[PDB]
Design a protein around this nucleic acid. Sequence first.
RNA 1: AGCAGAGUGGCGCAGCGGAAGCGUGCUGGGCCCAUAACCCAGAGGUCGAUGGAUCGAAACCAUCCUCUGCUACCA
RNA 2: ACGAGACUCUGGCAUGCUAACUAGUUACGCGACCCCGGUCGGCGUAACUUCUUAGAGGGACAAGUGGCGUUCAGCCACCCGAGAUUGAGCAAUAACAGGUCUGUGAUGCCCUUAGAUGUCCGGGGCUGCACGCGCGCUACACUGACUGGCUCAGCGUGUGCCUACCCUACGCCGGCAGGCGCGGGUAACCCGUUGAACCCCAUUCGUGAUGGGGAUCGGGGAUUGCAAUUAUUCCCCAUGAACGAGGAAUUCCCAGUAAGUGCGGGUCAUAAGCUUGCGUUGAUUAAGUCCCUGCCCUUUGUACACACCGCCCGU
Lengths: 144, 182, 67, 77
Amino acid sequence: SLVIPEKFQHILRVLNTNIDGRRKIAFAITAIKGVGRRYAHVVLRKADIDLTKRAGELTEDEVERVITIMQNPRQYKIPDWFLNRQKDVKDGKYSQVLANGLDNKLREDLERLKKIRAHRGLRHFWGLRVRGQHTKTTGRRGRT
Amino acid sequence: LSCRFYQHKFPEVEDVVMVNVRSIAEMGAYVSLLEYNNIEGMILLSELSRRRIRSINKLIRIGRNECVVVIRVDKEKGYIDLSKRRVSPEEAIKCEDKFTKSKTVYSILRHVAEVLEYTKDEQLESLFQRTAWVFDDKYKRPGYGAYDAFKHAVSDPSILDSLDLNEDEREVLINNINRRLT
Amino acid sequence: TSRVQPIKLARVTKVLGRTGSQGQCTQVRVEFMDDTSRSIIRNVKGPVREGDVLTLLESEREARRLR
Amino acid sequence: KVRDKLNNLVLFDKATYDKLCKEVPNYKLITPAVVSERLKIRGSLARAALQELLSKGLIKLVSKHRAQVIYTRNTKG
RNA sequence: AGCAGAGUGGCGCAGCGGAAGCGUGCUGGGCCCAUAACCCAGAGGUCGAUGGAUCGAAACCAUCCUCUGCUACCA
RNA sequence: ACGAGACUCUGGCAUGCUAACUAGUUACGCGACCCCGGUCGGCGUAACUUCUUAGAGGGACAAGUGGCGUUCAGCCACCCGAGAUUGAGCAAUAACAGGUCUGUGAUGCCCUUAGAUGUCCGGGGCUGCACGCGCGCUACACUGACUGGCUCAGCGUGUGCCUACCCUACGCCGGCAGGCGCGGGUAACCCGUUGAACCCCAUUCGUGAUGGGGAUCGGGGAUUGCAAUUAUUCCCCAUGAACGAGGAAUUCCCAGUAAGUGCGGGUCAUAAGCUUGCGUUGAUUAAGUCCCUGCCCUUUGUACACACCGCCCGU
């Protein structure tokens, strides 16, 4: 119960990143890049794990259950508007992407914008503010 | 872990001491005595200089060591008063010489205790009492009873073996003293 | 010092003008209860009136002016 | 000027549990903050342990609030 | 041919186990109606280089390089 | 004679006066529920102005008392009393090379006037970025963040002239931003008893640049509009930077005041980090001084008078 159980794992290696077991399970997997605070609640709600438990004392069955839920969102009654990548420009399907995939997709998106030589790609290549805000006063630490 | 330098828990009046300034205040300031286990003292705005001042940060310089003389010590409530205005340059040389030799002795004995792996304030107090405070009280010299002790015991093992502290820890401390003070 | 001065409790009798550079303090004519003959003038800081008792740590000082 | 970086444990081990069971009911003032400061434990663990001893009947409740709870020991006689 | 001094911020210099600073140069701000005085903050360092013991050297050790204080060209 | 004062608006009260189905109160009847009474912003009609609304009047004048003062102008404190200094509006002579020719079919002079400095359309710029400064918004957390429940306002505005563009209850669809049929209000009638926020209660969090903070950046979906790329605005999911109470210096204020907190109006097809008002919670300090920065009166000195930001001597 309140006494620490046997083989309480201190760290986790979910998707090749260190995840501590001291944080809450609704918030320890937030440190996985691509999954935030709101996305972590739905994954742990479709799967039958209570959110009052800690991260390092859950077992491998429910760990791999929520891991396959995170790599396969849509086949577990998760709606299509809950996804960080909807209607992708290459394959055209709704797919939630994770950390290294997120960096790869952002890198190839910026490469595509620079290749097509749009204004957004040119501003991203120059390293300035691209969303269209005033740069006369704010943004002083860009260079020395 | 840190331990105090001398057996006196608070310094006597009219005693020189090397002081690091911690923070400036309105009526005075907050400082820390290095050789008395980092207790909070006070320096006054009127105790800075006899002449007029045009910059308070020109001579205080929080983050820098300063030599001050003790003025009023209250052991009942832990109140320490310091004075930089009465500090003469004649005793200043002896002041950082005593401070450097005391801090090198403290560093050597703290390294020996860290090798011995004892993490307790009472344990450091007991081992440092067995090492330095006993011969300091024997020779009757505050600060001067340690550097000359290690200088005379680097080449003489019989002088260092007079203290009945331990055997293995005593040999480790003797080797650490002979390795540094050569 | 080597002198543990006993504290004196004294009662004001009248309020004089307000001295000081910015008028922060005022002068009072104050008298003691242990000897209700001795009356001294003191510079007191803060909101005072006629009837409040002041705790004097020493009783042998006479009130200086603003400078 | 010592830092002494804090590491407050989340789950009770063998020794902290029975030192709590021998020291916390012998405290005049019992608060989750002060028992977390004394035993170097996390705040939620302190609240859970004091709720457990409240259910066990060794802790007398005084006042209950959303900001803090105040607990006291029982009489020896 | 050789012995010692010195190698630190643009310049001058202090520092020897618990550890990159001072004077001054530059830039910016404040004070004033404005300028000069005055005050504050920041940037700028393989501590000449290499290797080693040391828990850990700008420092302890050995070598090399540079400019002076000196014996001097010595077959 | 002007200025001040006097005057005007508003706030603070009168169980007395005048009247309220576009504002209510109290009795009575009907109706619903609970265990003989209680609740109902459910329904309706016998008095009334206690709430609300707004008109005439009243009330405060240093009036009474005790001290200080030529016992004059006045000051201090106290009793009865809703108040014994509510807040604003208006505001004299003399001038400033103060700002406005970009408010004007107010205007002198000068320039241009058909390849126009008039006018109109299309595109762009007014946002552009090694840097400096000013007014501001959000934070640096546990007097706190998140998640539910409970509960309380006042100023306003609202279908427009050539002028097209209003505020919205109710029902359905969708997580949300939103979309479609139906009705009301030219307004104490409808939105609306304006179920506002801050607060209060109860979980989760536990001193960790952390569930603080939300900058930067990617994808998708709606609305306005002829047109949004240099992202109009909004919504959803990711990304999670600096920031640990701020150096020299400097601004504003003393009573329902500062501060915290939200709501209206102005711009508005789309629209508040700005301004102007409104209400809620609600303090610490002080009844003084001329020290700093300045102001009013008098005396004194002056080689200054576009008036000390003056004048003026020498190498």
